[PDB]
RNA sequence: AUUAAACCUUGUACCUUUUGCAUAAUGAACUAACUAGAAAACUUCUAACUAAAAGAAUUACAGCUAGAAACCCCGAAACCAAAC
RNA sequence: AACGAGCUUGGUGAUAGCUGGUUACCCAAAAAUGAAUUUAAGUUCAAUUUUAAACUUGCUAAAAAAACAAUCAAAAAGUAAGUUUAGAUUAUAGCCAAAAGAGGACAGCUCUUCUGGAACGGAAAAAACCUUUAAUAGUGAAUAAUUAACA
RNA sequence: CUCUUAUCUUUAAUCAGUGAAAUUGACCUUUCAGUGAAGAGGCUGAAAUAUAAUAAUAAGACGAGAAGACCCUAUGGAGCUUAAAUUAUAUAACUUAUCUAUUUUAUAGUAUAAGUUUGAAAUUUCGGUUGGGGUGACCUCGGAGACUCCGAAUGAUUAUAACCUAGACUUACAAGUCAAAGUAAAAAUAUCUAUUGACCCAGAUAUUUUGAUCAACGGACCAAGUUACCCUAGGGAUCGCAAUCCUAUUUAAGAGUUCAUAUCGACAAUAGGGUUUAACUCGUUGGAUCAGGACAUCCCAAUGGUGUAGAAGCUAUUAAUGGUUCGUUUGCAACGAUUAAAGUCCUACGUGAUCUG
């Protein structure tokens, strides 16, 4: 253009409206985004994606399902660094869901539970803390680090009611109250509870990891040596006390 | 450089001091000193209550001594006591109105009589209206004032004191129109007319910087005040009915604004409109009010209330004129 | 401010459309046209605005209007300009929800 | 144009600049060399794979990855530190 | 060897809404109005303009009838544009003629509103008035304004 | 100086040697009238006109050089002044402490810290609109008139005025307007007139609310003068009405008038000049030298008329031919003596690359 400020290359900053109070500064501050960096994120999983994954052989329904086997089959993508705390099952696709599977997901829903239970499956909810989740999504590198497997901390006070509640199928919930809660849900959605015990794969379905276990078959405090193909367990009494806790 | 108050004091020293001479010292300090306020009763339901309460305060109605329909309680001679702030009555009407005792003389002088129609040109919230309303037992009235905001509060004052039923009656009429133009509107309409022309307000001018006539910008208005006063006084003379009585009131001590204006106006009416005015003497009225008011007899016409240290109720210059034809 | 007739004759008018804004009662409300406190006129039903002049009969209660009407001579009849909105839609239709 | 270099006909230097006008006002004696537009948030275009893309951490209710595509020069009066 | 406060180096490529400058061809489209601002030698937004994409009515005109030569606008017709979405600036001082108000229910003068123009042809003068749809070669041609007036 | 001259040196000019500077778009570089921006070697219309040098003049080339002058602008500076704003272990002081002496609490001091009081200083600033200046002022909102006027940062009345939610007005943004339905209190709109202030940040309470003559009113949390001692970056220039009063011409209501004997003039009309009637200081040029032109003629010359006897005049026309003084007071205005007359004007004070106040 002609000679002037914008042509000299020295025009003001963005949001500067000539000298009147700018639009972005003259609006009241509100807490839309307050505490955003500490809010919990659960990468949702729908039942269409679950059934679709099972159909194509990218999830093994016969084996127990967990966050590791969802990530391994690329069914879900998880970013621990971005406050992801796990996967929440979602009600979308319940009607098409006709699969019996033992799925562990940090958050569950009423209707999502119905789809799993009606077809004769086990649904459980377990809390993984930020350190535990990173190892669960990405196991191999942790074994390469050489550090011992860590314990899994219990949920903080805010989440304690949820994971101790029978209706939510919490891992810490009382085993005795499960039957009644399942039956009430069964009546609500108009299906008859199937007898899992009679089912041949009762042991697999019923399988549940210890509340202090990140992986079903590995106890806290062990060390995995991939190069030698061995597992090392501490013999020290002091360390065993700490890990057993 | 000079404040309006400084200029106002300068004018009195060069002019007013000469007129009064040896009396000027006491008057000069009187104006600088705080003014004395006299409480005026609202009558109505609080008619008895205020009178009993004011007696407890030791204030005495100067009007009552004069008699021995307006009673205004005032403190004793040389008493500096301050009246308590006005308070609302049980009915919702203010118990009393604080005002300068001298300001009530023009109303008492106008000889209000029952079954009369009264005009109050440029009345403003000077208090004479409210006082006159209390006198207006059976008297239709009328109010006028050039400004609006000045007139706006005047209605508020009427709301506080005057009961709604009385105000609702046509008797109470509020308008804001030019006084000189008003003369043509209603000629020979009001038996009694009280005309309080805008004056230099010497007491207010010295104390108050706001809206002071002595400001340099307002030079034009100050010089033309005598001409405007004559026209307004002439307008009232036109409006008053045959045989009517009119009172012309000026706050200022100026000889030019007080005596020449009234006599000059009488001459103007006699020449242009061929009308005659009968002068009236209030010397007897002065004698009754000597205790509560002090006057000086130098003025050929009018009864000016000089502010005195013992009785600081001035300044009020009021002259009563009766329309002969 | 910017007082005028927003909706001219023949214009489709939705429920809440404001026909016009007036400082004083230049246009009086008509059928299916509500009157706002600020004296603006708003439609009430979908329709086509049509302006007509009709005899104005004031409510008995207000004194000023009644006195003025009486002051008029017997022969004379006053008129005012009104804004009307003729409904252009059927309020409802009947459909068979189910056969039982 | 012309047979003919000049005569005859036509024609108010250049840039910047003022309003979109100069007979103005700035700048240039001439030659050689040197002497001033630079960044990828959003968009467009082109491909790879595709509910997935990316050679670790990223984004996704057709996306994702890579490529190409962009924003000058000269000049104060001054201010501070430390030497002289 | 020019002290309202020495000089040298460094900070330092100080900063400059200001002045000056900013290097090949070709084709195409293309405007100094409103608002705020320590603002009126600036910037930001609206409006305008532009490149692409989406799909459908748009411009002139627009009878009756309103609200009073306009604000609005239906069938038509002459004709090809208009709306929405994504990206992006510069611009924000006009110049002159001719119309109409409005300032002292004046002319003028200062404003405001509408219209037009930016020759190589014409009008002693000649960017602004009048004739003139772009630009190309030809030793073709018909023409416009005008080339004063003979009262 | 009237009034200038003569001789000599220097410089100049010529022959010989040596060899700068500012400046320079290109130039084959004319006159007059016209046009134009106080403007023309170059454009328009006439005219003039072989080519080059040497030496002179300074009219033009808005001639060339300088850190000179002038008015205005910059959210550019710097010096000074403080009644500007913010600070201020310069100093001095005192107070409580720390701390060492001492006496039973006490008065002493103080390698320190925390305050209070002065301020030697440091830092930073100079809002906008008013044809310049001091004084007035005005800066936002709305009502009325077509810029002239009125108001406001609302008060009174209020048996107290919910929530939620279609569609719209207005509008750069921000702000500001109206509202069906649904739902809820109660037994539907508070009442006029009209009324503004963002974000940040501080206050309040048991979850709801309050903070601006921020009035320069889109609002910097908080900053005045002054410069002729100045500086830089640039831009500039170099008509109306009225109200009386005077007058002039035409009116003349009137009176008038009286042997080289008369008119004036009410009232009007019309041209001028004042006054009242509407905020509180001012903006190149004499002289010397040489002059060019205009005529609206001052003198010379040629004439008409005359209330022109002769002699002085007065009025008028034609004519631009040559001429058109010397001083004193000295800031131009007077004056004194003369002359046939001591013209009026234009030529950017006509003319400072000719000189000067
Ligand atoms: Mg501001
Ligand atoms: Mg993710
Ligand atoms: Mg040059
Ligand atoms: Mg620079
Ligand atoms: Mg415009
Ligand atoms: Mg500015
Ligand atoms: Mg600027
Ligand atoms: Mg020579
Ligand atoms: Mg030689
Ligand atoms: Mg030659
Ligand atoms: Mg030649
Ligand atoms: Mg020439
Ligand atoms: Mg010429
Ligand atoms: Mg020529
Ligand atoms: Mg010359
Ligand atoms: Mg500074
Ligand atoms: Mg908004
Ligand atoms: Mg409703
Ligand atoms: Mg401001
Ligand atoms: Mg402002
Ligand atoms: Mg505004
Ligand atoms: Mg000096
Ligand atoms: Mg000095
Ligand atoms: Mg001559
Ligand atoms: Mg002649
Ligand atoms: Mg002399
Ligand atoms: Mg010269």
From Swiss-Prot, chain A:
Would you name any one GO CC term?
Answer: mitochondrial inner membrane
Question: Is the keyword Ribonucleoprotein assigned to this protein?
Answer: yes
Q: Does the keyword Signal apply?
A: no
- Record keywords, A-Z: Mitochondrion, Ribonucleoprotein, Ribosomal protein, Transit peptide
Q: What is its main location?
A: mitochondrion
Q: Where in the cell is it found?
A: Mitochondrion
Top-level taxonomic group: Eukaryota
Record note on quaternary structure: Component of the mitochondrial ribosome large subunit (39S) which comprises a 16S rRNA and about 50 distinct proteins.
What's the family?
Answer: Belongs to the universal ribosomal protein uL15 family.
Q: What is this protein called?
A: Large ribosomal subunit protein uL15m
Tell which residues of the whole protein are contained here. Answer: 51 to 295 of 295
From Swiss-Prot, chain B:
The GO molecular function terms of this record are: mRNA (cytidine-5-)-methyltransferase activity; small ribosomal subunit rRNA binding
Q: Which Gene3D superfamilies match?
A: 6.20.240.40, Vaccinia Virus protein VP39
The protein's predominant localisation is mitochondrion
- Which Enzyme Commission number(s) are listed? 2.1.1.-
Location within or outside the cell: Mitochondrion
Alphabetically sorted, this entry's keywords are: Methyltransferase, Mitochondrion, Phosphoprotein, Ribosome biogenesis, RNA-binding, rRNA processing, rRNA-binding, S-adenosyl-L-methionine, Transferase, Transit peptide
User: According to its record, what are the GO cellular component terms?
Assistant: mitochondrial large ribosomal subunit; mitochondrial matrix; mitochondrion
Modification Phosphoserine occurs at:
147
Specify the enzyme's EC class, one word: transferase
Deletion phenotype, per the entry, is: Embryonic lethal.
Q: Which domain of life is it from?
A: Eukaryota
Catalytic residues identified in the record? 251 (nucleophile)
> Reaction(s) catalyzed by this protein?
a cytidine in rRNA + S-adenosyl-L-methionine = a 5-methylcytidine in rRNA + S-adenosyl-L-homocysteine + H(+); a cytidine in mRNA + S-adenosyl-L-methionine = a 5-methylcytidine in mRNA + S-adenosyl-L-homocysteine + H(+)
Q: Which GO terms describe its biological process?
A: cytosolic ribosome assembly; mitochondrial RNA catabolic process; positive regulation of mitochondrial translation; rRNA methylation
Q: Which residues bind S-adenosyl-L-methionine?
A: 126-128, 145, 150, 178-179, 196
**According to its UniProt record, which protein family does this protein belong to?**
Belongs to the class I-like SAM-binding methyltransferase superfamily. RsmB/NOP family.
What binding partners and quaternary form does the record give? Heterodimer with MTERFD2/MTERF4; this interaction seems to be required for NSUN4 recruitment to the mitochondrial large ribosomal subunit.
Q: What does this protein do?
A: Mitochondrial RNA cytosine C(5)-methyltransferase that methylates cytosine to 5-methylcytosine (m5C) in various RNAs, such as rRNAs, mRNAs and some long non-coding RNAs (lncRNAs). Involved in mitochondrial ribosome small subunit (SSU) maturation by catalyzing methylation of mitochondrial 12S rRNA; the function is independent of MTERFD2/MTERF4 and assembled mitochondrial ribosome large subunit (LSU). Targeted to LSU by MTERFD2/MTERF4 and probably is involved in a final step in ribosome biogenesis to ensure that SSU and LSU are assembled.
Listed name of the protein: 5-cytosine rRNA methyltransferase NSUN4
Q: Which organism is it from?
A: Mus musculus (Mouse)
Swiss-Prot record, chain C:
Single GO biological process annotation from the record: translation
Q: Where mainly found?
A: mitochondrion
Arranged from A to Z, the UniProt key words for this protein are: Mitochondrion, Ribonucleoprotein, Ribosomal protein, Transit peptide
Subcellular location field = Mitochondrion
> Which residue positions does the secretion signal occupy?
none
Q: Which GO terms describe its cellular component?
A: mitochondrial inner membrane; mitochondrial large ribosomal subunit; mitochondrion
Does Ribonucleoprotein appear among the keywords? yes
Note whether Mitochondrion occurs among the keywords: yes
Q: Which domain of life is it from?
A: Eukaryota
GO MF annotation, one = structural constituent of ribosome
Subunit info here reads:
Component of the mitochondrial ribosome large subunit (39S) which comprises a 16S rRNA and about 50 distinct proteins.
What family is reported? Belongs to the bacterial ribosomal protein bL27 family.
The identity of this protein, by name, is Large ribosomal subunit protein bL27m
Which organism is this entry from?
Mus musculus
Gene symbol of the encoding locus: Mrpl27
* From-to range in the entire protein, with total length: 49 to 148 of 148
């Amino acid at each position: 253009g002609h000679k002037g400020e914008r042509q000299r290359g020295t025009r003001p900053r963005l949001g500067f409206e000539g000298g009147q109070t700018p639009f972005y500064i003259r609006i009241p501050k509100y807490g839309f985004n307050e505490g955003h960096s500490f809010r919990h994120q659960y990468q949702p999983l729908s039942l269409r994606r679950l059934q679709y994954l099972i159909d194509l052989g990218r999830v093994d329904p016969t084996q127990p399902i967990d966050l590791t086997q969802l990530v391994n089959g690329r069914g879900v993508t998880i970013q621990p660094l971005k406050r992801d705390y796990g996967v929440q099952l979602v009600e979308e696709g319940a009607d098409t869901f006709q699969a019996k599977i033992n799925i562990e997901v940090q958050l569950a829903s009423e209707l999502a539970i119905a789809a799993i239970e009606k077809n004769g499956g086990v649904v459980t909810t377990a809390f993984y803390d930020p350190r535990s989740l990173e190892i669960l999504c990405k196991p191999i590198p942790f074994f390469l680090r050489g550090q011992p497997i860590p314990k899994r901390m219990l949920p903080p006070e805010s989440l304690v009611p949820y994971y101790t509640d029978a209706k939510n199928r919490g891992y810490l919930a009382d085993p005795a109250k499960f039957p009644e809660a399942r039956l009430e849900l069964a009546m609500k959605f108009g299906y008859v509870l199937p007898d899992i015990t009679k089912d041949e794969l009762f042991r697999m379905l019923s399988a549940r990891k210890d509340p202090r276990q990140i992986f079903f078959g590995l106890a806290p405090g062990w060390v995995v040596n991939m190069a030698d193909k061995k597992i090392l367990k501490p013999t020290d009494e002091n360390l065993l006390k700490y890990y057993s806790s | 450089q000079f404040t309006a108050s400084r200029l106002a004091l300068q004018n009195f020293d060069m002019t007013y001091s000469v007129q009064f001479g040896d009396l000027w010292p006491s008057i000069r300090v009187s104006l600088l000193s705080e003014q004395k306020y006299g409480a005026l009763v609202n009558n109505f339901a609080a008619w008895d209550s205020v009178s009993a309460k004011l007696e407890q305060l030791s204030a005495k109605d100067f009007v009552s001594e004069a008699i021995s329909n307006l009673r205004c309680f005032t403190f004793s001679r040389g008493d500096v006591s301050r009246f308590p702030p006005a308070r609302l009555g049980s009915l919702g009407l203010m118990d009393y109105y604080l005002m300068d005792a001298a300001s009530l003389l023009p109303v008492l002088a106008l000889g209000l009589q029952h079954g009369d129609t009264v005009l109050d040109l440029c009345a403003a919230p000077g208090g004479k209206t409210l006082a006159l309303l209390q006198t207006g037992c059976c008297r239709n009235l009328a109010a006028n004032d050039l400004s609006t905001s000045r007139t706006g509060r005047l209605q508020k004052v009427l709301h506080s004191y005057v009961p709604q039923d009385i105000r609702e009656g046509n008797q109470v009429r509020v308008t804001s129109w030019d006084g000189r133009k008003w003369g043509e509107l209603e000629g020979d309409t009001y038996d009694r007319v009280l005309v309080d022309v805008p004056c230099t307000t010497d007491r207010h001018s010295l104390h108050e910087e706001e809206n002071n006539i002595f400001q340099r910008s307002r030079k034009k208005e100050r010089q033309m005040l005598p001409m405007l006063q004559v026209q307004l006084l002439a307008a009232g003379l036109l409006a008053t009915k045959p045989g009517g009585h009119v009172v012309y009131s000026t706050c200022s001590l100026s000889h030019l604004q007080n005596e020449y204006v009234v006599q000059g106006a009488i001459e103007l009416l006699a020449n242009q409109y061929n009308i005659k005015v009968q002068v009236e003497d209030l010397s007897h009225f002065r004698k009754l009010f000597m205790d509560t008011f002090c006057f000086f007899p130098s003025c050929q016409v009018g009864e000016l209330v000089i502010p005195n240290l013992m009785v600081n109720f001035g300044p009020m210059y009021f002259c009563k004129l009766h329309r002969l034809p | 401010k910017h007082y005028g007739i927003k909706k001219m004759e023949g214009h489709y008018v939705h429920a809440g459309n404001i026909l016009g804004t007036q400082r004083q009662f230049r246009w009086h409300p008509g059928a299916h046209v509500g009157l706002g406190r600020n004296k603006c006129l708003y439609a009430l039903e979908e329709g086509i605005v049509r302006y007509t002049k009709d005899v104005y009969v004031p409510n008995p209660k207000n004194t000023e209007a009644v006195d003025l009407v009486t002051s008029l001579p017997k022969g004379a009849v006053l008129y005012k300009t009104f804004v009307h909105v003729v409904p252009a839609k059927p309020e409802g239709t009947f459909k068979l929800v189910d056969m039982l």
